[PDB]
Design a protein around this ligand. Sequence first.
Ligand SMILES: Cc1cc2nc3c(=O)[nH]c(=O)nc-3n(C[C@H](O)[C@H](O)[C@H](O)COP(=O)(O)O)c2cc1C
Ligand SMILES: Cc1cc(N[C@H]2CCc3ccc(Br)cc3C2)n2nc(C(C)(F)F)nc2n1
Ligand SMILES: CCCCCCCCCCCC[N+](C)(C)[O-]
Ligand SMILES: O=C(O)c1cc(=O)[nH]c(=O)[nH]1
Length: 363
Amino acid sequence: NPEFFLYDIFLKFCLKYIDGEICHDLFLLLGKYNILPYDTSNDSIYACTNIKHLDFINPFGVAAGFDKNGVCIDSILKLGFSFIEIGTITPRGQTGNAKPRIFRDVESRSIINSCGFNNMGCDKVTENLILFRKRQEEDKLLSKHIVGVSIGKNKDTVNIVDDLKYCINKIGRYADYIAINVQEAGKLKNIILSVKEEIDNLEKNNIMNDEFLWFNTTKKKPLVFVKLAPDLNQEQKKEIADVLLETNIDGMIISNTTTQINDIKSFENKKGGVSGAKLKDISTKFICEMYNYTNKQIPIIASGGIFSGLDALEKIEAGASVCQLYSCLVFNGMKSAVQIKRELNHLLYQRGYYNLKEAIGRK
Ligand SMILES: Cc1cc2nc3c(=O)[nH]c(=O)nc-3n(C[C@H](O)[C@H](O)[C@H](O)COP(=O)(O)O)c2cc1C
Ligand SMILES: Cc1cc(N[C@H]2CCc3ccc(Br)cc3C2)n2nc(C(C)(F)F)nc2n1
Ligand SMILES: CCCCCCCCCCCC[N+](C)(C)[O-]
Ligand SMILES: O=C(O)c1cc(=O)[nH]c(=O)[nH]1
């Protein structure tokens, strides 16, 4: 379509000449003004998926760090994504590290960043999410679309559990799921359990029925996911895997950015974590490991170097039930969701899968 094509041209221009974070904020602004294209197509009923009772109309969403402050949830979802993870948010606002703090490498389709958890803080973002939830009631294209919220600690926190607790008390009512982003097995167990308790306490301390308590999509309490970084050793992964089973966690997001990459020349003297195509193989391997160490009792959300339908099926066959995009949107533009959904549908057919669910963990 011409709407997608025109923006993809503008994107490639922007990619060549303009600073990354400036580009990002610009396009976010365009989304806020609601002048980005829509994908109004019906998603294949065979590519639908779920994390327990949380149902996704298709297997592609947008990862955390893209719309940190939830300023244009509508427009991003309407590009064809089934869900978005806003945040990571913190209890108080943070400016993050010094700019410029994000850099791309087009030929390797990789990104490096050291943002330092810049965000408007839980109060403001909660206000933004509420406004979205009200629009969602009115907007036909937002029905059954999921919004998760990634929460983290402040830069100089007094207590991590209390930081996450503050966020949950503020924004939990409006979230379909919560992503814990922070890592010793002992500390993690405490963190995970406190989060579950505080979510359960929202149900308790309210006199309203669920239909009027959970102002979200599921009309139930938010699930609890945890997001893991790829830079762990095997003993660390096994220990974590146990805690996630002990705590009965609803899902795990595999994975965040890596520091193990150094063969990107333009990133030679650059500081931060890498994402994009170079993270793909590392991330896929991580999924297989945690899918095994866990005995497949914890659903997985895939993240890392997913650009194509082919890339998607790898993550799924490794154990993932859903996929998150970020770098793809930077390098492929507005068509990312429309394209990847089409490719995965073709692939699931040619490979002789009846539906997507059948392909999870096959390899
Ligand atoms: C600029 C930037 C900001 C990010 N911010 C967050 C964040 O706030 N919270 C989080 O969990 N992950 C964050 N991430 C990691 C992404 O959510 C994602 O896990 C990672 O980029 C791998 O996906 P990709 O290879 O498709 O880009 C960020 C990544 C980038 C590049
Ligand atoms: C040219 C261009 C663009 C870009 N993001 C865009 C992607 C496409 C898109 C679509 C809808 C909405 Br709403 C928002 C955005 C943000 N980025 N992001 C970075 C980085 C590495 F994060 F800095 N560089 C970029 N360069
Ligand atoms: C030279 C500028 C290139 C961008 C093209 C701008 C026109 C796009 C119009 C999209 C319509 C938005 N929508 C779907 C909400 O109507
Ligand atoms: O905000 C950031 O700097 C950030 C957070 C995160 O979780 N992952 C990442 O790569 N960057």
